[PDB]
Structures are given as structure tokens and as C-alpha cells.
Amino acid sequence: YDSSSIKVLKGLDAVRKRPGMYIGDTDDGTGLHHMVFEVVDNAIDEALAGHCKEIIVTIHADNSVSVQDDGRGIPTGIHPEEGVSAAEVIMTVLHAGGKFDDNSYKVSGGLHGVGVSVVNALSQKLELVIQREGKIHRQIYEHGVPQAPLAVTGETEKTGTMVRFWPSLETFTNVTEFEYEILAKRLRELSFLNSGVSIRLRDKRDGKEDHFHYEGGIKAFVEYLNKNKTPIHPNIFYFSTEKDGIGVEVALQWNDGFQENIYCFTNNIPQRDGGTHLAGFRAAMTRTLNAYMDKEGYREGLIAVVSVKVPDPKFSSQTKDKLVSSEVKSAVEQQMNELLAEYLLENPTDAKIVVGKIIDAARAREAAR
Amino acid sequence: YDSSSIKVLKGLDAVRKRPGMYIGDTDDGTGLHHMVFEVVDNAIDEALAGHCKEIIVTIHADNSVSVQDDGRGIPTGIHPEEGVSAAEVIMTVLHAGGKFDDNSYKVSGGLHGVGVSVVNALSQKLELVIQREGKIHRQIYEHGVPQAPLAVTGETEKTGTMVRFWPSLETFTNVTEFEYEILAKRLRELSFLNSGVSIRLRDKRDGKEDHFHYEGGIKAFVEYLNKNKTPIHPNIFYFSTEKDGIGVEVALQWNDGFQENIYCFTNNIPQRDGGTHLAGFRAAMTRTLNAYMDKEGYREGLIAVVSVKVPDPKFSSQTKDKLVSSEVKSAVEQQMNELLAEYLLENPTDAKIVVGKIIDAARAREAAR
Ligand SMILES: Nc1ncnc2c1ncn2[C@@H]1O[C@H](COP(=O)(O)OP(=O)(O)O)[C@@H](O)[C@H]1O
Ligand SMILES: Nc1ncnc2c1ncn2[C@@H]1O[C@H](COP(=O)(O)OP(=O)(O)O)[C@@H](O)[C@H]1O
Ligand SMILES: [Mg+2]
Ligand SMILES: [Mg+2]
Fold first, then answer.
1. Longest dimension (CA), chain A
2. Residue B250 assigned to a binding site
3. Contact pairs from chain A to chain B, CB under 8 Å
4. Which residues bind ATP (chains A, B)?
5. Residues near B302 by beta carbon (within 8 Å), at least 6 away in sequence
6. How far is CA B109 from CA B25, B45, B83, in A?
7. Does ligand 2 have an atom closer than 6 angstroms to the CB of B161?
8. Active-site residue A38, yes or no?
9. Pick from A62, A158, B6, B94: most CB atoms within 10 A?
10. Which of the ligands is closest to the CA of residue A162?
11. A306 strand-pairing partners
């Protein structure tokens, strides 16, 4: 034990040595599919910026997945400081990208500079095809190692990025094939969240195919989620605001069931473990309903979607399961307080049905004890 | 948007730009204290290896924390490939350390090669003092930047490492002072887990002080945890095995309360979010009790500690909240099946009390519905 015991891992080698701090669980399917999501998220960030209007996700018969976007294309020109194409830099260097300021993407779900480079690292093979600057470029990688320099292989009028990857089985175990339904659920949700972006999903294994292009936003997303439940009130509460540089968008409606289903998103990335947006939502829900009950003389069945747009959010893991930016709590909480109280005044009937379900649950416990 | 839009973050700059993927939540106190834990974990890994027998954690009156160990000392000699002292490499290079193989630490809670380097990155100041090779060495950093080369400042017979850091307030917000009790709880738990390592905690603010040197292992840890609850049975179930290169150690006892408190650890690091060790524990608990009930003609109040030793575990975030190595499920599950069934045969009285509480809960629901 001395100075020769200390090893430095360079390039993408650290990712292959310790995948879980980057990609999550490489044994239950979730990190495998998160590989796709990292790539799709980059396309989505072109769409947010206004440049991409179609996304095509294909599950190939050889268990690879491609994501095609019609955005601006990953930059192709030689990187001054690094001396190789900017595209190769992106694919091979951790904490390298165009989202560390707000000049290329005002708001974006990427922010770590590691996503596609992590997909590369954990792919036995990867294929990159970029249309920009009137040219088609293309490069191949194996286990993150470029096989040759980014190369012009044609002319075109189109711009866009195509990434196809075959995941390494020396990394992913147990669940090793892509599941249509997991990719579908995510891409469907993304369509509600990105009105006007055409998002296609194709399974070359059995020829199954979906085209998601929903137009009603998260309000329609809530209708969809209650399709085969029974909503107890007709008016879905909805608002979209931006104040103090934070966008807050909320839709919700109660059904006659007994589960709570709250979807939280930050710049289109889902938070399984919630966070400061969720905590603001709950605080405003509590405060607003209790003021409505005080004034009128007085969880279960709730479906809600909470989507925020934030210039530099903070997540407590690479995979972004929990948003931990505390100023986002205050933002959702005050926007919601204000607009939810207006909703209850403007729809007295909905208000009463909802408050009645709430009280029925309280009485039910009380009748038990 | 072109190749000049693509920025590379070098050294420790990425950590300062996106702290949460490394340190967790920098707004609620948890990441602040995790700074201490990263440093303490490195000491603990010397203890696991058999080299460190005392650890002194001091909260200083200027809100800095020092951790002193009597282990081998961070290597001081110039690193061949990197050309600076191995110690400076450790402090300044991500994914750099002595735990990527098993030559320096057979088992260890570190594994990413990033912990202390992350503490450095997020410290407005850091002080390193290393006793090895008959010399005292010392180096200072500010915001992760070394102020001068590692330097010999004396002779000594001792070996050990001292790290003192002052956390940056441009990173940590809301909770910015160290809380005695948070450090105490963790260090206490560590003492149960590392019998024979003297672990001291000193608060130079008010002169409060603790010395943790518990000898009964996780069995004693369970007694402690039930101190001020009421255990319903006298015999704490306990075992420590190592098979197939995985160590599994479990203690548990039921009290007459109604909460479940299961502490999981991997190579001494706690998993707030559980994982494959927890899932193995639960599977074996279910199977073993149901076989005991079948044979005898037939969560609440449980306290349990599950500690595993694994050569290369996999966590799904830098902060290690969830162990995601699936072979650890099978290991805990079979060791526990085997030894828990023996415990129930060997202590028929305990067995009956425990199974009676379990059934009482089932009946209570049933009497409700
Ligand atoms: N589909 C894409 N279209 C255009 N540019 C992209 C695309 N994917 C990646 N990039 C560029 O490569 C950069 C690095 O991507 P990534 O490594 O995934 O990190 P991040 O998205 O967190 O920056 C992005 O910031 C962006 O500038
Ligand atoms: N207290 C210590 N005593 C001896 N060596 C240490 C100590 N702390 C750190 N090191 C060495 O520095 C290396 C890098 O530490 P760190 O960056 O925290 O990553 P990791 O613990 O995951 O390797 C460790 O692997 C170890 O070799
Ligand atoms: Mg990305
Ligand atoms: Mg460490």
C-alpha cells in the first residue's frame, strides 16, 4: 500500500467499472431502459428548444435501439481545445456538453454532461449519424472507443441526430431485452408534455408501432390517466405559469378510487422519488382546501401531473429521481395556492364533490376507531 | 449552436457545477453531513482492513470538521503516471483511488474513487496531514485547488491521516452548521459495526464529547435499539457467516410496538433505500416463519440489522442509498433461511411469542373488516 496502489480510471473506463452511480440498477431492467431515456432526453431537449418536431424510437430485431430526431444535429466541427470533433468529445468525455450555460438550450433535462457518453460507455456498439451544415456524418464506437474519426459520408438538406446502440451484456444482467411497453409509457407521457412533437415508436421484432402526437397537454394527460377510472367531478383543474424564471404547470382530477397517483417532472424528466415540486404541491393542496373548508363553514382518488421548468435544477443522483432545489418548492406552492383557490371559487360544484370525498375518508377512519 | 457551444469541465469543476449527483441534497443538511461521512468512511475502510484502531471526529468552533485516523496514511510518494504526489491525485482526480482491485482493501465501502475528492471540491478550504514512512506531510487546498505541493513538515513514528474541511456556502444552503446528533448516530452505529475500533466525537463549540467502543457487535446494536422499547422475547436472533465470498450478518428482535425498523448496511455504508440485502432478508423471513407455522399446526414491532460484506457491490447513486447487486439477495436469503429456522427450533418459546404477535396483527385487521 503506497503510491503504486492508486489507480486513475480515464475516459469512459470509470463508467464501465462502476455503472450504477451513472445508470442506476443494471440488474432489474430499469437501468437498461434508462439507456434509451438518456438518448431520448437529448432529443426532447432539442424539441424544448423549438428545433425538433419528430422523434422516432426503433427497437431493432438484433436488440439494439435507435433514436432519430430532426433537431440541429450534434456539432460536428473539430473542437479547438480537445482537437477532435465536438461529437467525439460528447461521446467520450464525461461532463462535456452544451447545457452548462443557457446559450444553446434555455431549459433542458440534461445538465450533467454525461448522459450519451454513459450510454456509449455501456454499449458494446454504438452508431452515430448526424445531419448538419449540409453534410451527413457518421462514426462507430465499440465499448465507448471510436473506430475512426467522425467522417462525412454524404450531402443533405436535413439536420438531425441518429444514435443506435447495442447494450453491453457484461454490464446488464437479468433483464437484457427491451420491453415495448416501458418505452411506450415514457414516450406517450412525453407527447402529452411536448405538444406538437411527433414521437414514433417501432418494434422491428413484431412490427408493432405507435405514433404519439397528443394535443391537449397535461390536461389531456390527466383525462387519459382517468380513462378507465371513474372521475367524480367534471372539471380538471389546470394551470401553466412562469414567474421568477420558474415554469409551473399542474393538472389534477379526483376519481372514486382510493389510490394516489402524482406524476412529477422537471424539464420533462420524471422524478420517481418526487422532491421539492411535490412538497410544494402538497403544501398548497393542504393550505388551499383547509381555507376552503374554513370559509364554507366546515390523497385518495387523486391523479395529478406537476411539471416544472427550471433553469438549473439540482438532482441528488445522476438518474434524476429526486429534485432537491428548494426554491422550486416555494414556486409551485405559491402558484398553486393562488390558482387552486380560484378554481374552487369558480367551480363550486366540483369543490363540494372533492371536499366531500376528503371528509368521507376522514369519517371512515373515525367510524373504524 | 456549434462546436464552440460544447464545454468540457475539468478537474473538480464538474462537482462544483453539479454537486447533487455526487453529494446528494445540498439544501436539507443531508449532503452537508454526508461530507463528513465520506471522510469517516475512508477511515473505516482502514479499520476493516485491520490497520486503524482509533478514529477522532471533531467539530471545530469555526464550523469545520476534522477526521483523524491511525491507519496507514494516504500514500505520499510521487505518482509515476500523474507526476504529483499520490495524495494530491486522490484529492483532485475523480475516479482515482486504491479500491478498484482488492490488493489494498479486501472489502471496502469506498469503490467509486470520488469521495474525498468530492469533499475537497465542495470545501472552501481543506487541510491534509498524513503520517507515513517516518514523515509528517501536509497540504492545503482551496475550493479543491492545492496551494502548494505535498510537503514534509516533520519526523514521526505514527501513521495516519488527518482531513479537516470547511464546507463551501456557495454550495450548501439552508442547513450550514454541523449537528452533533447526526454525526453521533452514525458514529455510534459504526462502533457496533466495528468492534475494537475506538471512535471519538468532540464538539469544540460546547465541549460535548462521546467515546464509542461498544463490544457486543450488531447483537448489542439491537439491544441498544430496543433500550426504551419493550422486547417481547428474550433471545436476540443473531448470526455472522461468510459463504461464496459474501459476508452476511443479521441480528433481530421483536418489541411490543407497531413500527418496523430495519437497518441495512453494505461494507459498513447504510442503505436508506434498502435493496437486494433487504429483499433477501424479507424473503427468508416470510419463508421461514410460514414453514414454522405449517409445521406447528397453524413487520410490526421488528428491529433488525442486516450487514453484508461484498467484494464489489453495486449502488444506483454515488451516495449509496440502495444496493442493487442481485447475487446479494440470494446470499442473505439462503443464510437466513438456514439459520433462522435453527433459531426457531432452538428457542421454541421465543418462536411462539413472535408468531403470536404476527397472528394478533392478522386477526386485528380481520376483526376490523
Ligand atoms: N440529439 C442531440 N441533438 C443535438 N445535440 C445533442 C444531442 N444529444 C446530445 N447533444 C449534445 O451533446 C451534449 C452532451 O450530451 P450528454 O452527454 O447526454 O449531456 P447533457 O445532456 O447532460 O449535456 C449535450 O449537452 C448537447 O449539446
Ligand atoms: N483515511 C485514509 N487512509 C488511507 N488511505 C485513504 C484514506 N482516505 C482515502 N484514502 C485513499 O484515497 C483513495 C481515494 O479515496 P476516495 O476518493 O474517497 O475514493 P474511494 O474511497 O471510493 O476509493 C482511496 O481508495 C484510498 O486509497
Ligand atoms: Mg443528455
Ligand atoms: Mg472514499
1. 75
2. no
3. 179
4. 1, 69, 98-99, 105, 111-116, 318-320
5. B252, B254, B260, B261, B262
6. 20, 7, 28
7. yes
8. yes
9. B6
10. 1
11. A250, A264
